[PDB]
Design a binder for this molecule. Structure first.
Ligand SMILES: O[C@@H]1[C@@H](O)[C@H](O[C@@H]2CO[C@@H](O[C@@H]3CO[C@@H](O[C@@H]4CO[C@@H](O[C@@H]5CO[C@@H](O)[C@H](O)[C@H]5O)[C@H](O)[C@H]4O)[C@H](O)[C@H]3O)[C@H](O)[C@H]2O)OC[C@H]1O
Ligand SMILES: [Ca+2]
Length: 124
């Protein structure tokens, strides 16, 4: 598990840390082409699944690309998030990823807006 608001670096001119109504925090005000960087993520044993707690009031879907090494590095999967009913209505959404082990920098690269609280890598 990784908290979006605990990124090491980012590329954005708009991203803000936001709250949720449950007393948590996360990332909003994301625009197309922004990315969050999480350095030295040990995928440990194995990961073939990605789950994120996300909210969206957008009227088009946002793709969250999961890239290793650089923003144009190996693409291991893409979570596509349509509206959840509103910007403060969080749901947990999952995608499969190419099985990943070892230590990589992780770039979440966004095609549009989404509010994100946290994400979890697991093996189904
Ligand atoms: O304390 C807590 C508060 O922090 C919390 O505040 C909420 C923080 O998050 C806010 O959500 C932002 C709402 O505004 C969005 O910008 C939208 C994004 O969509 C744009 O339009 C898009 C254009 O591109 C199209 O292709 C796409 O389909 C469209 O959707 C629109 O122009 C922008 O206005 C941000 O992305 C969100 O992060 C939320 O409103 C606050 O309420 O509230 C709870 C409290 O406990
Ligand atoms: Ca969070």
């Amino acid at each position: 598990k990784i908290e979006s608001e605990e990124y090491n670096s980012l590329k954005s001119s708009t991203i803000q840390t936001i709250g949720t109504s449950d007393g948590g925090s996360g990332i909003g005000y994301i625009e197309s082409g922004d990315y969050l960087v999480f350095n030295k993520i040990n995928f440990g044993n194995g990961a073939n699944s990605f789950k994120a707690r996300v909210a969206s009031g957008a009227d088009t879907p946002t793709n969250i690309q999961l890239r290793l090494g650089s923003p144009t590095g190996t693409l291991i999967g893409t979570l596509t998030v349509a509206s959840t009913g509103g910007w403060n209505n969080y749901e947990e959404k999952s995608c499969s990823i190419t099985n990943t082990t070892g230590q990589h920098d992780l770039y979440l690269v966004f095609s549009g807006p989404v509010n994100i609280d946290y994400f979890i890598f697991d093996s189904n």
